[PDB]
Symmetry: none
Subunit: 503 residues, 3 copies
C-alpha cells in the first residue's frame, strides 16, 4: 500500500537479548482505543491543522502498558484502524503520513505532508482504514523505562469539509483511532514488577472538599464556587503546584506553614511607636534563608493588609518568665516603611509605655486577624520588582476559574460581613502531587465531579498542568456547588478541548 | 637472496566496513545517490588552513568529522533524508617552497577516544600518513564508519571517525629573508563506494549543513546597533580599548541574542514604562518610571541587566515622552526630560530592578496624568563609553568582554555619530559597534549551525571586483583584522561581504596595511 | 578428608539463552584484533576477588557486586589501556569452602542492564535468574556472565550499562561447635574470558586510565614526613584510650586525589603561614604585630570553603614562632625575633584566621624601630598543647572537614606519631601528636588521581628484614586506615615495613584481629 520496506523485529534482537517473551494470544484479536486518538472536523476549519500525532510504543495499548512493568525492553510493529463518521452528502479529505523517528518537530504544511509515505482518505469512507506502524530504529531493542525516538503517525486536514447544517447544530465529522500489536511484537527480559513506572495514570485522593485544608489561610474549606465578576488572572504566590510535582512560588509542603513565619528577633523601646521588634527571617524548619528566585521564604503571606501575630516572649523581670505577646505588623501595598521580606527582614510594633525586658532569640509568628484586607501581593521590596510566579491562565473563550473559598478572622467597625479568601487547589492536593511525581502527557486532565451515594454527575472541568481548574460557564452571577462530592480523573485532553457548558 | 627495498610508497591498510548491509533490515528505505558523485574530489566546507613559523610542534591544524558535512553535494542532498551511512575519502594539498622544512602527521582517531590533549609521541599510534610541506602532489586517505549503531541521523551530530592534523616538526626557513611566510593548505573529499541515505522526507531548507550566508546590503545603507542613526564609518583603531563590554548589538552566529540586544532597530536606546509624576517643590517636576517591555509585556528580573534595548553607555540623556495635561486649553504635548545614566552617587538608578527617575525644571506644578510612556533619545551630555548604573551599586549579569584575539589582530568597528550638547568644543561624538543592524537580524531568523570556530570573509568592491581585505568572523559575533599599524585606518563603505569558508581558531590572515 | 558437607552446586539450570559476542561487532570494525590464546586457559583472581561472611551479618546484605567488562581480569584490565571498545561474555568461579561446623545460604543473581541501583531487597532477588549456594560447598561454583545489550560494542574509557552479578546473604551464618567462637568464611572470586571476547580498535597505550588499580610509594614510615607538625615520623601505633573520631584539618585527602580541609601539597607549608605585617608599640604588652594573612606562594587569600589558609595550625595552645625583621636604627639591619601567639579560643579572641587577621606580641621596653613588609612565620615552640580545633571564627561557625569515621564494631584508627618541642616547668615527658597519613601519601594521591572501585582497599604490612607479614588493614576511600584491635592498652609496631595493596573491599569486610 505505502512505499516502505518490511522491518525485522525479534530476528534482530534475539542474538543479544537474554530472553524473548511471548504475549497472550487473545490480545492480538482486539482493536483498542488509543490515548489522544480522536478529533472533530468543522466547516470552519482551515486545511493544514493537525488532527492527531501518535508515537509508536507500549503506551498506545492499556494491556501493553500494564505488561511493560515486568520487562526491560520491547520490539516490534503494530497495526492501527481509523474510523470516520460521515455520510453520503459530505465532502473533504485528510492525509495520514508516516514520519520517521528523527524528523525535526515543528509545523508542517499541506505541501510537505504528501512527501512522506502516506494515504489520502475521503470523508465519505464507509470502512475503517487499516495502516501499519513499523519499528524503524538504529538499535536492537528499546528500553521500557526510557522513552526514545520512534515512528510517528500524523493526520492533517487536506481539503475542507463542505456540508449543509440545520438551524440548531453544525454537523462536525468525528474520527477515532484504534490499534493492536502485530504478530512480530515481543518483550525482552523478566524483571521484578516496578510500581513507579512511567506509564502510570494520574489519580486524586478520595477526600471530600469539606474535609480539606485551605492553602492560603489556615482554616477549613467552606465553599466551592465560580464567580465571573472577579479578577480572572490572579497572581497568588501560595497554593501553586505543578502536576508533575514541582512547587511554585512560596508554596510550602505542610499546612502548618501557611501565612506564618519564623525569624530571629531584636526588641527595643522607642518613646514613639512603643516597643519595636526587627525580625530576621529564616525557614520554619530551622534552615538558613538565602534570597534566591522566589519572593519570600516558604509560607510567607501573599495578601495585603494589617496583620496581628502572636509570639512567645520571655521577660527577664522578676515574678514573670514566659508569656505570649501579640504584635501588629503592616504588610499592605506600598505602606511607608521599608518592608523587605525578599531580603529577609521585617518590622513589628507593640503599644507600651515602658521597656518590657524581653530576651532575644528564635521566634515563630502565626496570624490572628487582618484589618483592611486586599487581594494584592504584599510589599516584598520597597518599590522594586521581585521574582514571582506568572498569573493564573490563560483560559479558553468562555472558561472561568474554579475557586475554593474560606473565611478569615476580621477586625472592622462599620461592616459585619464575612471576609472571603479563595485558592485554586486545597493543601492536600499539593502534597499529593509533590509525593507522587507523575508523568505529564499532553496539556491537561479531564475530571468529573460526582455525588458519592447516588452517583450523580454535577459538572465537568479541566485540570491544567500548571495547577488550576477551569469550567465552561456562561452566566454572570456567582454559581455555588455542593462540597460533598469527589473528583475523579477521566483521561488526558488537549488544550483546545471543548467542555460541556454548565448552568 | 631475499631483498628488502629501502623505499616503499605508503597506503595505510584497512579492513572493510559494512554499510547498508547492516542497516537494511531495520531501515524503511535505502536510497541511492548519483553515480558521478563518486568520481570527483570537491572542496570541503571546512577546506582552508595555514601553517606559520609561529606554530609549535603539537598544535592541531585541522580536525574533520565523517559525515555529509564534508561534501557540498552530500550536504545539499541531506535536506531530504533522515539518515546516512557509509565511508568517505579525503584529499589534502599544501603550497610550499623548496626553502621550507617541516613535517606533519594526519591520523585516524576512532570515536569515543577521549578528547583531551594528544602529544607528538601518541599521534603516530593511530593509522596515519606522514607528509612534508614540500610535496607537489595531493595526498589522500580513507575514512571508514567505525560505529556501534546501525546508521546515523542527519539532524543530530553523533560521534564518528575523525581526521586530525598535527605539526610533527617545526617549520623552518634556512635563511629567513621572508620570516613571515605562510603555507596554505586545502582539503577536498568524496564518498566511497559504500555510501547511502536512509529515509526520503520533504526537503527542508532550514536544516543543518546549510551554508551560512549574509544579506547583500552595503554597509552605508544599514542601521547602527547602539545608537539610532545610519552607519557612516567603518574602521580599525589600535589606540582604543581592545576588549569593550558593550551590551547592545551582540548576537551569536547560531541566533542567540546576548545582553539586552533587541530584534528591531527601533528599540535601541529607548524604553517603555508606566509614569507617575510629582512636584518636589524645590527642583520641579519629577517622574518615576516603572519599566516594562517595549511590546507591552511585563519585565521580570532575570539573567539580563535591563529591558531589551536599554542604553549601555554613560552620560546625561535628554528624552521626549507624550504628556496629557489636566489644565484648561491644552490637551496633549511632547515633553522633554533630563535623565542621569552614568553613576556618580545619586538618583539611585536601578533599571535591573525596574525603577527609573527623571526630572524637568518648572516653577509651575503641571498636573500630568499618570500612565504609559515611551522614551526615545534626544541628546547626550558628557558621553562616556562605559556601562551605566545598572543596579544601585551592585553587580548584575553581563555579557563577557569581546575577545580573545590572536597576536596581531584588531577589532573592526562600525562608527556612527551622536547628537550631543557641548558648550565648549564643536567636535563630533562618535560611537562604535561590532555588528550593525540587519546583522542582528538574519540571525535568529535563520538558525545556522557553526561547524567550526570562525568564518573567513572577503570584502569586495561592487564593481571592478577588487579585494580590499580579509577578516575572520568569530562565533561570538565580532570581526577581526590582521593589522600592525599604530593609528586609525578607514575603509570605503560601498562594499559587499562574501562568505568564503569555515576556518579554525589558529588560522593566519593576510596582513593589512595602508 | 570428610564429606560432612555438599560436594557441588554443579548443575542448577539458569533460565537464559546464549548470547552472541564479537561476531556482531566484526563488520563494524576497521581492524582485525585478537587476544593471546593462552589467556583463555586458566582462572585468575579478580581485582575485587576477596570477601567475608561473618556471624554478625544479617540477611539482605550484599557481599559482592561485579559489573561485566574488562575490569574483572588483570590481563584484560592491562590490555584495555590500548584499545577503544570491547565485547563478549565471561566465566566466573566462586570459592566458598567453609568449615563443616557451619551453616548458611547465599543467592547469586543475574541483574540485567538498566535495572535501578539501590534497594535490591531480599524478596525480589529471587525474581532474577539465580543460583542458591551453601557455604560448605567443596568444589568451586562456575557461573556465566553474558553480554545482554542493544549496541554492537562498549567503550572502554566509559562505564556503561551491562549485566551484573550480585551476591546477597540469604540466611545467617551459624556454627554448632562446642566452644568459644564462631568461624568466619573467606570467599574468593576468579575469572576468565569466554570464547567470543575481543577488543575493537588499537589506541595509544596511556597509563592513567580508569583501570590501573591503586599503588603506594615504596618508602618506610620512619623515612617519611609528618603531615601535622614539621618533624619526622617516629611511631606507628593504635590506642583505644584516645578520642575515636578526631576532626583534624591537616593531612586529609581523598583516595581519588581531592584535598580536604586546609591540607597543603608541600610539607614545608605545615603549621606555618605568610602575611603582611604591621608593627606597633603598645605601652602595655610591648610590641604588637598584626598580620593580614595571604597564601604561602604569594597569592591572595579569599575566605571561601575552608576555615583557614592552606597549612594553618589546627590545634590549640600558645605557639612561639620565629620571624625575620628589619629595623631602621644604626648598627643593626636584619635579625630574627621570636613572637608569642594564642591559638585557643580563651573566651577572648580578637584573632579570626577565617578572615585573615592575627596578632602576636613581644615584650619590649623601648620601641624597636621595626619596618613593615611581608613575612613568613614558622613554628618554634608549643606551650599547653591541646588536640582540639582552634577558634577559626571568634565565636561563629566555619566550614570544616567531617570527623574521621565511621568504624565497624571492634575497629580502631592507626596513628602515625611524632613529638613536638615544648616548654614545661615541672613535667619532662615528651609531647606527642598523631596523624592519619604522612605527607608523602598525600602528595602521591594528589598527583596520581586514581579511579576508585567499590569502597576501600585491603593493605598488608610486611617486614623488610624478614619478609614477615605483620597485620592487615582497611584503607577507606576517605583517607583513613582502620585495624581490628580488641585490647585495652596501646599497641605499637615497627616502622621499617612497606604497605602493599591487595584488593578492593566493601565496608562490610571483616578483618582478622591483631596480633
Ligand atoms: Ca468589609
Ligand atoms: Ca564634544
Ligand atoms: Ca607537657
Amino acid at each position: 500500500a505505502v512505499p516502505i520496506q518490511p522491518v525485522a523485529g525479534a530476528a534482530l534482537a534475539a542474538p543479544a537479548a537474554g530472553q524473548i517473551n511471548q504475549i497472550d494470544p487473545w490480545i492480538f484479536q482486539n482493536f483498542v482505543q488509543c490515548p489522544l486518538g480522536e478529533f472533530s472536523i468543522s466547516p470552519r476549519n482551515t486545511p493544514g491543522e493537525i488532527l492527531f500525532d501518535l508515537a509508536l510504543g507500549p503506551g498506545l495499548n492499556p494491556y501493553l502498558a500494564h505488561l511493560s512493568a515486568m520487562y526491560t525492553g520491547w520490539v516490534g510493529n503494530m497495526e492501527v484502524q481509523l474510523v470516520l463518521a460521515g455520510n453520503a452528502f459530505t465532502a473533504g479529505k485528510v492525509v495520514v503520513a508516516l514520519v520517521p523517528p528523527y524528523f525535526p518537530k515543528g509545523s508542517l504544511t499541506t505541501a510537505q505532508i504528501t512527501c512522506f509515505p502516506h494515504v489520502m482518505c475521503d470523508v465519505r469512507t464507509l470502512e475503517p482504514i487499516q495502516l501499519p506502524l513499523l519499528d524503524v530504529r538504529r538499535v536492537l531493542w528499546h528500553a521500557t523505562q526510557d522513552q526514545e525516538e520512534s515512528m510517528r503517525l500524523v493526520c492533517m486536514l487536506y481539503t475542507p469539509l463542505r456540508t449543509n447544517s440545520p438551524g440548531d447544530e453544525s454537523f462536525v465529522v468525528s474520527g477515532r483511532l484504534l490499534s493492536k500489536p502485530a504478530a512480530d511484537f515481543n518483550f525482552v527480559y523478566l524483571t521484578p514488577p516496578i510500581e513507579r513506572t512511567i506509564y502510570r495514570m494520574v489519580d486524586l485522593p478520595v477526600i471530600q472538599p469539606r474535609l480539606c485544608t485551605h492553602a492560603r489561610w489556615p482554616a477549613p474549606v467552606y465553599g466551592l464556587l465560580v464567580d465571573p465578576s472577579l479578577p480572572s488572572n490572579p497572581q497568588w504566590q501560595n497554593g501553586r503546584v505543578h502536576v508533575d510535582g514541582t512547587l511554585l512560588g512560596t508554596t510550602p509542603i505542610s499546612g502548618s506553614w501557611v501565612s506564618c513565619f519564623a525569624a530571629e528577633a531584636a526588641y527595643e523601646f522607642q518613646s514613639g511607636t512603643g516597643e519595636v521588634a526587627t525580625f530576621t527571617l529564616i525557614e520554619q524548619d530551622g534552615s538558613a534563608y538565602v534570597p534566591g528566585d522566589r519572593a519570600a521564604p516558604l509560607g510567607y503571606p501573599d495578601f495585603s493588609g494589617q496583620l496581628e501575630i502572636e509570639i512567645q516572649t520571655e521577660t527577664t523581670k522578676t515574678g514573670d518568665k514566659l508569656k505570649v505577646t501579640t504584635f501588629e505588623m503592616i504588610l499592605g501595598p506600598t505602606t511607608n516603611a521599608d518592608q523587605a521580606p525578599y531580603q529577609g527582614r521585617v518590622f513589628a510594633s507593640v503599644t507600651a509605655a515602658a521597656s518590657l525586658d524581653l530576651v532575644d532569640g528564635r521566634v515563630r509568628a502565626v496570624p490572628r486577624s487582618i484589618y483592611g484586607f486586599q487581594d494584592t501581593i504584599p510589599e516584598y521590596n520597597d518599590g522594586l520588582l521581585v521574582p514571582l510566579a506568572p498569573p493564573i491562565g490563560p483560559f479558553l473563550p468562555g472558561e472561568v476559574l474554579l475557586r475554593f473559598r474560606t473565611y478569615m478572622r476580621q477586625i472592622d467597625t462599620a461592616d459585619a460581613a464575612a471576609e472571603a479568601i479563595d485558592c485554586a487547589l486545597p493543601q492536600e492536593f499539593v502534597s499529593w502531587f509533590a509525593s507522587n511525581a507523575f508523568t505529564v502527557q499532553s496539556e491537561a486532565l479531564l475530571l468529573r465531579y460526582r455525588n458519592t451515594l447516588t452517583g450523580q454527575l454535577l459538572f465537568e472541568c479541566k485540570l491544567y498542568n500548571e495547577g488550576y481548574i477551569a469550567l465552561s460557564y456562561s452566566g454572570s452571577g456567582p454559581l455555588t456547588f455542593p462540597t460533598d462530592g469527589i473528583f475523579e480523573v477521566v483521561s488526558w485532553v488537549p488544550r483546545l478541548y471543548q467542555l460541556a457548558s454548565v448552568g
